[PDB]
């Protein structure tokens, strides 16, 4: 008879909607606990002796670094398999690879385009698989983000988080869905063209009706920002993206500047700014210089003033990438005793 | 702000009454979880880098071995201080010693006569203190015993444990109170002269009113034994004890033989024999042979036939000393994330 | 006076022909023992504190992974140096690189085209060098493969292993020689155009005289397959290979299908299928889809039916890459006592 | 050529007069550094893999515990060899034993009566030997004590330390000699009968004339106490010691009470109390009760008021036993780079 | 299917006669290899994570130390349980103790009088049990001793080892049997009253027939010493032994002096002296002084001159206790691959 | 109150000018001390549990291997981020990245073009940053080189090091400034066109006025070489460089041949050859062969004869990359006690 009890052990983490509010909060709180342990020098090698594969079909170095430092702190050894090292379903079926990866490694991180690849990995490897970012979901960023909110405010339910800018990018989609599950009010403040899809809004609405989260999807700043505890943003455009100027044109009214922070009406001690990074907040980059020389644009989604102001939590948030991934890997692979969530 | 959550962390374990049924069950289940891990060779060095002081006012080598091996499995180093090494309250106050011990060691085991010494250790050391046996309580034995019961039957509540023999020895006292807390029915079957004291009985009664445990103290063998899922015993006489012959004479009718096992009415798959050991079940000892010449006794509290029967779980129960101590130390000192019991 | 005894210690593994049947069996048996150890969670950090350099002139991720996870299980830390990181003999002589490498690392894996590079590395580095694949030899694969055969059968001598298809591919060449050294009967069933070379045949014939191995090279399916304990195949064509249609047409009759298994005559309890992977057994790849569209071909060297049947050992054999490499690195660098092979 | 540089490595620590002020201060400062490291959770396993013998001819459990916890923190394993385990020069010559101890262990602690035994151990073992207390010297207590003074005041030279009571016991002798080396003024306030010997005073006077330490040996409280930064004491009598009443009679005027603390004229922020322990400061012990029942004596060398007052540093001092022994073992055995003191 | 191969794994070492010459040489050779490893700082934690119980019915500190330091070098943690801690078969049967011991610890050292206790431990504990000395056998000493001979000479077979003095002492008995198994010629030079028993002589004669060992038992010094490669002795009398003066007088002519070495005829490069220790070779003991005063005796079984001469290997042999025990514990518990001995 | 003392702890190593001669000597000597330790297998896991980021804007595999092996020997885990992984200042500011890197990693290596990027890394990361090579400085190469000089000669001050060839390449620049700081006489022997810039010369001059170093920049081979204890060179042309033919033509008279070694006037025991590598000393490379066909050159900056002569120390110098980096990391991150340099 198997007397091991742990509701997370062996589970994959592919999509944040596969986890209940209680499960998400556990992992968030576990992350804050391990953050405290690491600050104090308290050992927590729950993955002692293990091997972990870190698959990236596209370079995602901050996520890699979070998974790497997390693995080491837990006593596991991470190996990076990037785009030149691995191409799933290209010359060998994803299923065949999963099986061989699973026979050698104890856990698998997967970052790549297809959610379906993540699922086959989870189905066939026989080991926990963690989604480091797909086109559909970004669960590790969500864990970090809500950990950061709770780190600052102490209690998630009934707080308001406002995302400004592209309400159709996959971080906004994840924030809307994850906030709904957790009972956090979510405002998406975007141009109409970039409102979340009906499919995304429906998934979020389903969860919100059970949690009591209020969800507002609007192109009006003043309506959107009022009451926010968190103002969150992300980049408007990519490296030589299509319809670049059209996107910038429509997005520029939704820049997080100090006026936007004022529009919330929220007291200073109840308001923070978040950004999943990288942020175009100045011209300190090669890209930044080029954009300026061509358009005279000096900041995009956030002003430097806000980025460097007392509201700023994006650096704590980026550190929390690591602490949250650590709790996730530990819950899921460390054979810890967790009889109940 | 401390985001560490653990209801056990830093707590001492001096008395089983100081723990709720849910806390006791957690520690039992954790012991079973950890027993599995060790069997599988899954690492669990939760006390990595730590030092532990093991104090013994009297030799208690089975308790010592259990704390020792448990400490090593957890990553901690134990140092044994016995009767020739330490004499708490003899020349230096227990308070003074407790403060010094606590400044060098991360945790302290104490086995000695005075509960007050255990309490002072806990009050002044600043570290977890674990009671390896006092005149008043034996909590590690209780964790091992109810762990053993659960390992065999599952669900503890509603089962029936019967202690037969000296109903006033400290294991019987502990079993009565602890079963009462856990909702396990407890029968003490003893001579009238060796019924547990009014205080022990009334402490147990207070817990039983809330848990639903049925408590029976009786001199009637057939009333006592009926319905038992466990038949538990212990030595009749100890260390050339006073009133020796009288104790044996009042006690022998309460020997655990196959005929006693049959009086329970219980089927082979719902019935086990337990004994905290050492046991006088044969003539295989210097003490045993002397008792045969003087008294014609070849077995005392349990016959060799019961001790070697299909019902015997005493050797499992004794290994469980180690696994249960490990759960206790781990929960209390490992800085594990335990938000809710 | 050096009282250390180990026949493997400090030796490079560059070519399977460089070791006797006794030495190869020891490594194989060592691998099956270590596999057992890992399954039981039994520690074996024979390479504790060591650094290992993994050189790959071309991407070879399955091999990279086996070496990585093996290193870690043994307590050594592997660093991957791939094509963008190293070019032996391009800018700096392979000899100079070997010396510096050998001065920092404790062992060196090399995968590259030229056997002479493996030899210069072994000659000049001063550390064990392991050939992860060259144009001439694939020793670690042969270790995995015969470990797999023994895992299924026990005594290797007198068994029959049949490779079907491109009998000129370096896997088939290695199998012929290694099976020859080991006293395994090797059958190569290939169109005459793809028979092993006279040089390959002559090397294997030398070893087989002494071992008693029966070598058969034939284009006749029925004569080749008859009495096979193992049916082994590999890809007909690689990434954008010349003579593509020629190769596919001549190799098509040598597809491992259920009829091919049936042709062996061998009872179910004496017959396995093996494939060094990746295999084209279905249409679950981008490549597989392009072949199905252009040619109507759905499966090549092995049918999905054989691939997913009770005969299939590919995935065990693939896992065994790791266990076999661990034995090889352990014998060769672990400073283990091995007085006699 | 040996490029290792460390002026302490391989040296024994048998007598504090064998070390210069610079060497003593280094070890003191090193102790405060390692204390900081341990509080912060910073690893410092400088004796990783080592075995250490802890010899005690007489039970000295606080010293054992300091050596034990120190060894573990440094990564060394301590084994306790007490009076029933070892009798030097009894049935085997001390020299023969030293040689065998030295061939198995990496370091040796020795606590026993004869300084000459310590020296033979140091001469013949080939490993560092540390004196845990002999009739002649107590170097580990001195390291702890001056570490404690520096921990509180920040700079040893020109401070005043006053020992009150038995100026002939070996801690007072060591304090006088060690204070002289370090440039700390030392007052010994004792009855004339218990003034330090001429031999001890001469050793101290020799060192003091080079350091500029002032040394006062007096039976006058008011002369002795004035200007003290430290008031230090120790027990007047042993367990059933000879001339017990005569010693108590002469010593009782030299009790450290609150009046004595006042006699210093030192401001509150520049005054501390020290005691090497155990202290008879109340009646919380078996011995304490017995002394009271026979003499009505309730406190001896220090009052409870002083022991529990804001001047008290004896518990920090007792913790520092460990931190100081740790620096001593690390300097002397860890193969650290220490080119200069 | 268990693919683990190891002839020693799980086996107890209770009596040297229980192992073949091949097995004994392997252990010996394994010891010299591990000694080399330790001298080079090469890791070998083959017992990583294990707990070991060290039982001593009587104080035996040199043996205790060898086992302790060996355990630690191998990664296992030893706990000492001495006379005040354990009394096998006194209160509790040795069988019951064995079972519980075996359930917590991974191996068990036993030093005690009764061989039957060693056997019950091996039979009931379920773990390897190592005999650290019984009335009948001293295997670990024989391993140290022949390791020492091989360390000096190479090929053991055909060598001559001569024990001088009490040919009835259990060292001499073990040497006769072990030398017999190994094909070493054994000479026992003893007064006729102290010849080995007929039982001891007959055991050794059985083994010598097959090994070709020449056994000589004689009271003639010149015939016994002739051709010796090793002159080995041990104490004439123990702690308060009866027949003291009788024993000393009859044994006095068998003192190992320089004349005894000269009597061998053996060239300096082929002659060593050995003594299992402690040795009475001078007057540097309390005991030695009492013998000098009472009897004028200054040296007994060996002169200081021989003890400190170019022939002396006692201290190497003593260090070798450790290296030989490490090999024995490593072979028997390390789960090392040993397919053939 | 922080009683931690270490002058290096937390400092970055961006430029050799930022360190005093005494600090540089300490790190050199520490490197030699640590080289001995590793040779002896003495543990020195000073960075136990740490994570280190190794950034490379361009491939630099010898520098990488040195940081990697050094990290592992110290107990730290390195992760390599190369040109396809990280692009500092391209899309995210170096400041932003530095902050994130520093929140996850305990230390950062940086190899890239801009010194300003190294400085920003140091300013904003909050961790030690080590310069693995910029356009302006190469401090780890300098530590390795002067470590090598001292390893051969001892005393650095008063010796003479001569760099021959391109007197403007960054190794020559570094050698001039660093020798100047350390009091080593430096001769640059170069064509006039390749004399070090006025700035490099004037920086060196400022250090030489204080140290007593004699600096000579000259085109005269015989004036340059005379009195040299070291002849040091480096490649003439790099990565299909511009002005290629002109560089070779002005450079060839400055080749290191045996005749150059003889012009020093220095005896065989006071003279060594150094080269930071890779070296073009033969035709054993693809690049070498092309240069032979196009130019008739079979060797460039150094002949094979000098490269393989008794003077050659370049392979020692290259191993020393690792040991010197280890000293740097250890002093800067190990939290070692270093009160005074
Ligand atoms: Ni790594
Ligand atoms: Ni221990």
Q: Considering CB atoms only, which of A59, A62, A73 is closest to F100? A: A62
Instruction: Give CA–CA dist E75/E329, Å, rounded.
Output: 11
Q: Show Cβ contacts of residue B75 under 8 Å, excluding neighbours closer than 6 positions.
A: A43, B45, B46, B47, B48, B49, B50
Residue D298: CB atoms within 10 Å: 14
- Which region, left, alpha or beta, applies to residue B193 given φ > 0 means left and ψ of -120 to 50 means alpha? alpha
Inspect the interface and report whether the beta carbons of D318 and B86 lie closer than 8 Å. Answer: no
Q: Which of C88, E280, B32, D22 is nearest to A339 (CA)?
A: B32
Q: What is the DSSP string of C222-255?
A: HHHHTT-SEEEE--S--TT-TTHHHHHHHHGGG-
Q: Which two tokens stand for residue D125?
A: 């073992």
Q: What's the full length of chain F, in residues? A: 341
Q: Which of D136, D109, D107 is nearest to D49 (CA)?
A: D107
Which run of H or E residues covers position B261?
A: helix B258-263
Q: Show Cβ contacts of residue B88 under 8 Å, excluding neighbours closer than 6 positions.
A: B55, B57, B94, B97, B112, B117, B121
Q: Which of B272, B27, B15 is nearest to B143 (CA)?
A: B27
Q: Considering CB atoms only, which of F4, F26, F32 is closest to D3? A: F32
End-to-end CA distance of chain A: 22
- Separation in Å, CA B124 to CA B110, B139, D258, D304: 14, 21, 24, 16
8 Å CB contact between F282 and F288: yes
8 Å CB contact between C277 and C62: yes
Q: Which of E305, E168, E308, E184 is nearest to E238 (CA)?
A: E168
Scanning every residue of chain A, which has its alpha carbon at the shortest distance from the alpha carbon of D41?
A41
State in Å: Cα D115 to ligand 2 middle. Answer: 27
Instruction: Give CA–CA dist D157/D155, Å, rounded.
Output: 6
Instruction: Give CA–CA dist F70/F68, Å, rounded.
Output: 5
State in Å: Cα D41 to ligand 2 middle. Answer: 22
3-state secondary structure of B94: helix
Instruction: Give CA–CA dist E141/E130, Å, rounded.
Output: 12
3-state secondary structure of C115: helix
Q: Which two tokens stand for residue E69?
A: 């330091």
Strand partners, E233: E164, E275
Q: Where in chain C is the domain with CATH 3.40.50.1370?
A: 1-140, 141-320
* A251 cis-preceded (ω within 30 degrees of 0): no
What number does CATH give the domain C141-320?
3.40.50.1370
Instruction: Give CA–CA dist D199/D190, Å, rounded.
Output: 17
- Separation in Å, CA A36 to CA B1, D43, D298, F128: 9, 17, 47, 22
Contact with chain C for residue F193, Cβ under 8 A: no
Task: Write the DSSP symbol of residue E196.
Answer: P
Judged by CB atoms within 8 Å, which residues 198-257 of D form the interface with E?
Answer: none
Instruction: Give CA–CA dist C29/C331, Å, rounded.
Output: 12
Exposed, middle or buried: residue B202 (CB in 10 Å: 0-12, 13-18, 19+)? exposed
Q: Which residues of F touch C85 (CB under 8 A)?
A: 59, 61, 64, 82
8 Å CB contact between D38 and D323: yes
Residue E216: CB atoms within 10 Å: 16
Half-sphere exposure of B167 (CA within 13 A, CB side): 28
Q: Which two tokens stand for residue F126?
A: 């909050």
Q: Is A111 a catalytic residue?
A: yes
Residue B293: CB atoms within 10 Å: 8
In chain E, breaks (C-N over 2.5 A) are found after: none
8 Å CB contact between F299 and F282: yes
C128-154 per-residue burial string, b: 16 or more CB within 10 A, e: under 16: bbbbbbbebbbbbbbbbbbbbbbbbee
Encode F70-85 in three state secondary structure: HHHHHCCEEEEECCCC
E316-320 LR contacts (CB < 8 Å, sep 24+) = E316/E148, E316/E151, E317/E144, E317/E145, E317/E148, E317/E274, E317/E275, E317/E276, E318/D99, E318/D100, E318/D103, E318/E62, E318/E144, E318/E277, E319/D100, E319/D103, E319/D104, E320/E31, E320/E35, E320/E144, E320/E145, E320/E147, E320/E148, E320/E151
Inspect the interface and report whether the beta carbons of F73 and C51 lie closer than 8 Å. Answer: yes
CATH class of E1-140: alpha beta
Q: Show Cβ contacts of residue B272 under 8 Å, excluding neighbours closer than 6 positions.
A: B148, B149, B152, B229, B230, B231, B311, B312, B313
Q: Which of A19, A311, A12 is nearest to A180 (CA)?
A: A19
Give rounded-to-5 percent helix, strand, coil for chain A: 45, 15, 40
Residue E155: CB atoms within 10 Å: 8
* Alpha carbon E210 to its chain's center: 23
State in Å: Cα E315 to ligand 2 middle. Answer: 26
3-state secondary structure of B230: strand
* Alpha carbon F46 to its chain's center: 24
Residue C288: CB atoms within 10 Å: 22
Q: Of E11, E64, E73, E111, which residue is the catalytic one?
A: E111
Q: Which of D167, D175, D173, D111 is nearest to D142 (CA)?
A: D175
Experimental method, per PDB record: X-ray
Instruction: Give CA–CA dist D321/D328, Å, rounded.
Output: 11
Q: Which of F121, F12, F124, F122 is nearest to A315 (CA)?
A: F124
D62 carries a ligand binding annotation: yes
Sheet holding B51-56, edge to edge: B77-81, B51-56, B107-111, B129-133
* A299 cis-preceded (ω within 30 degrees of 0): no
Task: Write the DSSP symbol of residue B168.
Answer: T
8 Å CB contact between F300 and F259: no
8 Å CB contact between E298 and E333: no
Q: Which of D210, D175, D224 is nearest to D196 (CA)?
A: D175
D23 CA: distance to closest CA in chain B (Å): 25
Which run of H or E residues covers position A109?
A: strand A107-111
End-to-end CA distance of chain C: 22
8 Å CB contact between D278 and B92: yes
Q: Of B111, B187, B247, B323, which residue is the catalytic one?
A: B111
Inspect the interface and report whether the beta carbons of D61 and B81 lie closer than 8 Å. Answer: yes
Inspect the interface and report whether the beta carbons of D104 and E65 lie closer than 8 Å. Answer: yes
Declared resolution, Å: 2.1
F203 CA: distance to closest CA in chain C (Å): 33
Q: Is B321 a catalytic residue?
A: yes
Residue F315: CB atoms within 10 Å: 16
C157-183 per-residue burial string, b: 16 or more CB within 10 A, e: under 16: eebbbbbbbbbbbbbbbbbbbbbbbbb
Q: Is C340 a catalytic residue?
A: no
Question: Which ligand approaches the C-alpha of residue D76 most closely?
Answer: 2
Mutate which: F41, F235, F285, vs C, most C CBs within 10 A: F285
Q: Give helix D61-74 / helix D314-333 axis angle, nearest 10°.
A: 50
Strand partners, D78: D52
At F336, give phi and psi (nearest 5°): -70, 150
Give rounded-to-5 percent helix, strand, coil for chain C: 50, 15, 40
DSSP alpha helix (H) spans, F48-161: 61-74, 94-104, 115-125, 139-153
- Which region, left, alpha or beta, applies to residue C274 given φ > 0 means left and ψ of -120 to 50 means alpha? beta
F276 carries a ligand binding annotation: yes
A131 carries a ligand binding annotation: no
Q: Give helix A170-182 / helix A139-153 axis angle, nearest 10°.
A: 50
Q: Which two tokens stand for residue E152?
A: 């000096």
Encode A19-41 in three state secondary structure: CCHHHHHHHHHHHHHHHHHHHHC
Instruction: Give CA–CA dist B133/F20, Å, rounded.
Output: 63
* Alpha carbon E172 to its chain's center: 10
Question: Which ligand approaches the C-alpha of residue F76 most closely?
Answer: 1
8 Å CB contact between E152 and E313: yes
Neighbours of chain F (3+ CB pairs under 8 A): A, C, D, E
Instruction: Give CA–CA dist D161/D273, Å, rounded.
Output: 10
8 Å CB contact between D9 and D328: no
Instruction: Give CA–CA dist E110/E95, Å, rounded.
Output: 14
Exposed, middle or buried: residue B182 (CB in 10 Å: 0-12, 13-18, 19+)? buried
Instruction: Give CA–CA dist F189/C187, Å, rounded.
Output: 68
Q: How big is chain D by its Cα radius of gyration, in Å? A: 20
Residue C241: CB atoms within 10 Å: 11
Q: Show Cβ contacts of residue D48 under 8 Å, excluding neighbours closer than 6 positions.
A: D74, D75, D76, F43, F45
Half-sphere exposure of E333 (CA within 13 A, CB side): 31
Q: Which residue has the tokens 């006095």?
A: E252
Instruction: Give CA–CA dist F268/F258, Å, rounded.
Output: 12
Instruction: Give CA–CA dist E27/E24, Å, rounded.
Output: 5
Q: Which of E268, E25, E328, E17 is nearest to E157 (CA)?
A: E25
8 Å CB contact between A110 and A117: yes
> Strands (DSSP E) along chain C, which ranges?
51-56, 77-81, 107-111, 129-133, 160-164, 185-189, 215-218, 230-233, 272-275
Which run of H or E residues covers position F38?
A: helix F21-40
End-to-end CA distance of chain F: 22
- Which region, left, alpha or beta, applies to residue C195 given φ > 0 means left and ψ of -120 to 50 means alpha? beta
Mutate which: C65, C237, C314, vs A, most A CBs within 10 A: C65
Q: Show Cβ contacts of residue C202 under 8 Å, excluding neighbours closer than 6 positions.
A: none
Contact with chain D for residue B90, Cβ under 8 A: yes
Sheet holding C77-81, edge to edge: C77-81, C51-56, C107-111, C129-133
Instruction: Give CA–CA dist A51/C68, Å, rounded.
Output: 9
End-to-end CA distance of chain B: 22
Which run of H or E residues covers position F292?
A: helix F286-295
Residue E135: CB atoms within 10 Å: 10
Q: What is the DSSP string of E219-265?
A: S-HHHHHTT-SEEEE--S--TT-TTHHHHHHHHGGG-B-HHHHHHT-
Strand partners, D6: D338
Half-sphere exposure of F324 (CA within 13 A, CB side): 27
């Amino acid at each position: 008879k198997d007397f091991r009890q742990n509701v997370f052990q062996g589970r994959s983490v592919l999509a944040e909607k596969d986890f209940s509010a209680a499960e998400l909060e556990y992992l968030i709180d576990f992350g804050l606990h391990l953050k405290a342990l690491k600050k104090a020098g308290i050992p927590h090698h729950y993955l002692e002796g293990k091997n972990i594969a870190l698959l990236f079909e596209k370079s995602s170095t901050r996520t890699r670094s979070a998974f790497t430092t997390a693995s080491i702190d837990l006593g596991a050894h991470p190996e990076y398999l990037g785009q030149n090292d691995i191409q799933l379903g290209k010359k060998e079926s994803t299923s065949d690879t999963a099986k061989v990866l699973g026979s050698m490694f104890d856990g698998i991180e997967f970052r790549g385009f297809k959610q379906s690849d993540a699922e086959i990995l989870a189905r066939d490897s026989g080991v926990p698989v963690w989604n480091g970012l797909t086109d559909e979901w970004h669960p590790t960023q969500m864990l970090a983000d809500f950990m950061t909110v709770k780190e600052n405010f102490g209690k998630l339910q009934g707080l308001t988080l406002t995302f400004m800018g592209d309400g159709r990018n996959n971080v906004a989609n994840s924030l809307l869905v994850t906030g709904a599950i957790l009972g956090v009010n979510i405002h998406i403040v975007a141009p109409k063209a970039l409102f979340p899809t009906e499919e995304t809004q429906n998934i979020a609405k389903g969860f919100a009706e059970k949690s009591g989260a209020k969800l507002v999807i609007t192109d009006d700043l003043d309506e959107g920002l009022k009451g926010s505890n968190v103002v969150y943003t992300d980049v408007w455009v990519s490296m030589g993206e299509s319809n670049w100027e059209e996107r910038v044109k429509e997005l520029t009214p939704y820049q997080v500047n100090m006026e936007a922070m004022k529009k919330t009406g929220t007291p200073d001690d109840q308001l923070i700014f978040m950004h999943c990074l990288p942020a175009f907040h100045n011209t300190d980059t090669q890209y930044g210089k080029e954009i300026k020389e061509k358009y005279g644009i000096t900041e995009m989604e956030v002003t430097d003033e806000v980025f460097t102001s007392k509201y700023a939590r994006q650096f704590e948030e980026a550190e929390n990438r690591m602490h949250s991934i650590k709790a996730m890997m530990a819950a899921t692979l460390g054979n810890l005793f967790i009889p109940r969530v």
